[PDB]
Amino acid sequence: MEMEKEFEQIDKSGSWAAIYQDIRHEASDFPCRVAKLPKNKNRNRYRDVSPFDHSRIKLHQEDNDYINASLIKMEEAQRSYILTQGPLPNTCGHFWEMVWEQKSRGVVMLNRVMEKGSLKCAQYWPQKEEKEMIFEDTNLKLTLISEDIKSYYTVRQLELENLTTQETREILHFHYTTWPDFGVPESPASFLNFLFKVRESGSLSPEHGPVVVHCSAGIGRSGTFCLADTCLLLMDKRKDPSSVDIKKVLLEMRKFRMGLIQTADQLRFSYLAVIEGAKFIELSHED
């Protein structure tokens, strides 16, 4: 059963919503007590999107160790990912502290700071070389070193400095800039090219800390990136690529963070991306 053929059946039946709701009903439920403490209220973008206690990232500071972020450990694929919400104005220092402490090399961003006229994400990196950002609370300095703007995505080289030790580290920021305001990309071509760029950079390698991935809530678009990448890894690993079941992979990742893949559309897109990814390895004025 090629994923290909299952896709065609689901599409012919119009049953993407029914499959997605099955996945919702079978998904793990673990407690999130820490996330729900009163003092962490202002560290969560949404009241219904919380990291599970067992897989949450702890900040290595003393006063409050809480950040809305989850370590997704995919054991057979041998890759790990941190999935996190878009930083809030008050949690930007905590975001970079996490990056520092976890020894991440890359950050993947899948939203714009501003979408449908709402702030989805704080401007948590410097837009200009000459205006560095100082996070006073976590004692970090962040500088824009360079940026390569392409048509579907931007890669920035950032320097993060620990002002306590003066150690510096180069962070790669991979920003997918063209996810539509509504729905999903009609084609996964640019998303896949993006993903292979992140892989090519070495940021997903085992010599680094887990890559940091976010969108606004850290579960929808972020879920598509990790699901797609893990499925692709699993196909290559196993003698058989037609034995990878994206449904069961998704359920496995949902043991580490709630809600990954948030719409039936996003589920369909992730199927598409894995199918086109595996393979790889009209005149109109509607406006």
Ligand SMILES: CCc1cc(C)n(-c2ccc(N)cc2)n1
């Ligand atoms: C058991 C899960 C696991 C095993 C390994 C080697 N990693 C890993 C962690 C981070 C990165 N960048 C790559 C891989 N994660």
